[PDB]
Amino acid sequence: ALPQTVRIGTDTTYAPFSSKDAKGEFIGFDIDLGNEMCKRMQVKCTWVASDADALIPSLKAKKIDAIISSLSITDKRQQEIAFSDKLYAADSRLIAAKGSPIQPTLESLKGKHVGVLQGSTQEAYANDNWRTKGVDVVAYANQDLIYSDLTAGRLDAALQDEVAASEGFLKQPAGKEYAFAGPSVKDKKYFGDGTGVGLRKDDTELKAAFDKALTELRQDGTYDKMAKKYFDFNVYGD
């Protein structure tokens, strides 16, 4: 059976998906999706703010029943936990000067300087896929020095999370003469081909319920109405 109340963990440091406003309220597209699915599942849901690194451990330990926290459905994570069907994509993407001919291909990136943030999944992807095939991958301690170096012409491009870059540089005046270079970069091992509700593998009833509610809110147009509040592109991907 489903619990009387489903506890959902989320890392509230990631607008526009999950954050806390000035009154401490949970806000974001994750919160909207979670709340809408819980409504259709007719279960009470309680949001629980958690450190990012504590989400999966808390889930495994049954401190929470679900994770909705832009949790990429990576191959590695699927060794340990289950996921709902995809909620939206969390792929990465190149940013470069507006009009740049750069593409996320080996042929285009050969001999180019591509900035990535130290310790990021973007760094991992670029080091494992591009650095070893003739791309000059430069790792940064500070995200903002990446952007500054891009604007200064010390980088050809920067590999960033797509929505984070969209909301955090491209929408700022500083990013006005910059744009995505090519399409999003997709990889099941690094970016997950989607985010999903993170769930314990044995909780099949809970996953089925989330999956059912999600297809229904997508099919009757609720998904797009909710997404339009935050995004002017196809955030779902796919």
List the resolution, Å. 1.7
- 116 CB neighbour count, 10 Å cutoff: 26
H helices of 43-142, in order, are 55-60, 106-109, 121-129
> For 235, left (φ over 0), alpha (ψ -120 to 50), or beta?
alpha
Residue 177 dihedral angles phi and psi, to the nearest 5°: -100, 30
Of 97, 68, 95, the closest CA to residue 81 belongs to 68
Name the DSSP letter for residue 95: E
Q: Identify whether the C-beta of residue 194 lies closer than 8 Å to the C-beta of residue 86.
A: yes
Q: Which residues of 152-184 are buried (b: 16+ CB within 10 A; e: fewer)?
A: eeebbbbbbbbbbbbbbbbeeeebeebebbbeb
Measured CA to CA, the distance from residue 96 to residue 179 in angstroms comes to 6
**Which residues does the annotation place in the binding site?**
11, 69-70, 72, 77, 121, 161
**Which residues does the annotation place in the binding site for L-lysine?**
11, 70, 72, 77, 121
Please, which residues have CB within 8 angstroms of residue 183's CB and are 6 or more apart in sequence?
93, 104
Of 194, 223, 237, 164, the closest CA to residue 34 belongs to 223
Percent helix, strand, coil in the chain, to 5, is 35, 20, 45
Measured CA to CA, the distance from residue 92 to residue 113 in angstroms comes to 17
Q: Identify whether the C-beta of residue 179 lies closer than 8 Å to the C-beta of residue 95.
A: yes
Bridge-based pairing state of the strands 5-10 and 44-49: parallel
Q: How was this structure determined?
A: X-ray
**Which residues does the annotation place in the binding site for L-ornithine?**
11, 69-70, 72, 77, 121, 161
Residue 112 dihedral angles phi and psi, to the nearest 5°: -95, 155
**Which residues does the annotation place in the binding site for L-arginine?**
11, 69-70, 72, 77, 121, 161
Measured CA to CA, the distance from residue 89 to residue 86 in angstroms comes to 7
Domains of the chain: 1-90+192-238 (3.40.190.10), 91-191 (3.40.190.10)
Q: Identify whether the C-beta of residue 195 lies closer than 8 Å to the C-beta of residue 70.
A: yes
C-alpha dihedral (137, 141, 144, 147), degrees to nearest 10 = -10
Measured CA to CA, the distance from residue 27 to residue 25 in angstroms comes to 6
The three-class DSSP label of residue 198 is: strand
